[PDB]
Amino acid sequence: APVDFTQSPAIFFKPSPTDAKNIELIGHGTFLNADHSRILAKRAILTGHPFRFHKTVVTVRYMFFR
Amino acid sequence: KGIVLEKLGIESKQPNSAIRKCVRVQLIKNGKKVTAFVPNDGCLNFVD
Amino acid sequence: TDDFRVLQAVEQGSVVPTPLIHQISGSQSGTNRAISDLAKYNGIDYLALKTMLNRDYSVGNTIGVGKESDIYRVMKIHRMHLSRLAANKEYQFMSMLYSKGFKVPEPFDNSRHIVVMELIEGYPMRRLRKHKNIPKLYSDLMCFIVDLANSGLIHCDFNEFNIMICGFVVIDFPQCISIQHQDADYYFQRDVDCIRRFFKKKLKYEEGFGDGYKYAYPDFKRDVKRTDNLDELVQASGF
RNA sequence: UUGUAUUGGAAUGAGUACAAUGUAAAUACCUUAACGAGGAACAAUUGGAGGGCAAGUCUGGUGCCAGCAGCCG
RNA sequence: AGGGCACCACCAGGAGUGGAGCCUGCGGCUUAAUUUGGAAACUCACCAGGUCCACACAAUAAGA
């Protein structure tokens, strides 16, 4: 978005013409900074079932199929 | 009474380990500059 | 690795009390990143590898194991304090010889009682049976002993267990001694006799030495002329 | 005769109010006809529970961080 | 620091092992698996492919 150099307060809403004031208020906050070095990582989780147990190894099912 | 200049974190003395939240303040009646602690955790969001 | 390197570098400050981990080492994040890596005789081995891992690009594979050292393009590791000393003696001793014309494996690096060397192509001499030109080979093993004696050193056990296949190369130098030692001739004649036995028994063979040269095989009081005194750079034995 | 929980009549002012009293004239206090309790919702808070210093081996969460802490922690 | 003890320490020695071929245990490699740490079936725990098998509501039976 465009930059603001005054750290203005911020209000967040979504339009909703069914409402008596046509607006749905969601939250509030503040403009912090411009910073491209912010890295966001999306994350996925695979999961599996351990089912046989030995003193130094475990074997796992259903996480993979080939 | 004073005016808030900027927001700071202060590293605690050893052996404790924490970054504690403080502000720089200029006193209205003197112009002298001071650092103050902000109690109660998330309360730092109330000051700017 | 600075959180681990300093964790080792502080270890010279000496048991070890718990407060040494709080104020002997250098803070937020630093007091946690050590656990984040640290959570995943032995430690001075399992972690001490880190120096090579940083300064040295393949982990390779296992190759050999021995009573006092283990072996894994080839890496050698010694077996709490003295192990760092032994490695340093070996590294500089080899390095020194290789700077002369001697046919030994080239050293590349040494750190923290770990040494890295060239990997030899050949196969052990003890199972050689059919070399296409044994007469020149006999000559050149003999001449090699003369060179070392000139430079000031006597191998203790110059025999087929430590020669690999002039195409030969000599692979280790346990318990070498200087030419000044009181028993120098007695060990010298063993090496000559040991090499003669092999060529007679298996190969049937029996300026140079042997046939085509005017002197049969070297002798301790011949062709030894104190050329280089390399036994002073490493005080091998006998001052 | 003492505890713990289903049920019943009694008692009263906070408040509102005709009147009189009070007062320079008033407001309020004292007095009083009528009205005014069943989660009597006509619902007491402010700080604490390691020690100093009265009072929890209770139960869920969290990750030396957020935090607590006059001092020892 | 001293002092004492021991052929899992030495001294005087014996038989040796380490070098050859083969048997066997462990690690590593390979593999669908070479299970885990006196094995041809079973043992068996491993691999490939096959059969077979609660309680509480609504419908059903003199043939469930």
Look up the CATH number of domain C64-117.
3.30.200.20
Print burial letters for B9-33: b (CB count within 10 Å at least 16), e (below 16).
eeeeeeeeeeeebbbebeeeeeeee
Residue C120's CB is within 10 A of a number of other CB atoms, namely 14
Second CATH level (architecture) for the domain C123-232: Orthogonal Bundle (1.10)
User: What is the CA angle C79-C59-C51, rounded to 5?
Assistant: 60
In whole angstroms, give the CA distance from residue C198 to residue C125.
Answer: 10
Cβ <8 Å between B17 and C23:
no
- Backbone torsions φ then ψ of C76, nearest 5 degrees: -125, 135
A37 touches strand E (CB under 7 A): no
Spatial CA neighbour of B39 closest among B15, B22, B16: B22
Q: Which residue carries 């147990």 as its tokens?
A: A53
Spatial CA neighbour of C90 closest among C69, C62, C67: C69
User: C23 in contact with B at a CB cutoff of 8 Å?
Assistant: yes
Cβ <8 Å between B11 and C27:
yes
Spatial CA neighbour of C144 closest among C155, C160, C131: C155
Pick out residues 1-30 of chain B having their CB under 7 A from any atom of nucleic acid strand D. Answer: 12, 16-21
Cβ <8 Å between C28 and B14:
no
Determination technique for this entry: cryo-EM
Resolution value, angstrom units: 2.7
In whole angstroms, give the CA distance from residue C164 to residue A41.
Answer: 55
Residue C147's CB is within 10 A of a number of other CB atoms, namely 15
Question: CB-based contacts of A47: which residues, under 8 Å, 6+ apart?
Answer: A63
Q: State yes or no: chains C and B have 3 or more CB pairs below 8 A.
A: yes
B22: distance to nearest CA of chain C, Å?
A: 17
B17: distance to nearest CA of chain C, Å?
A: 7
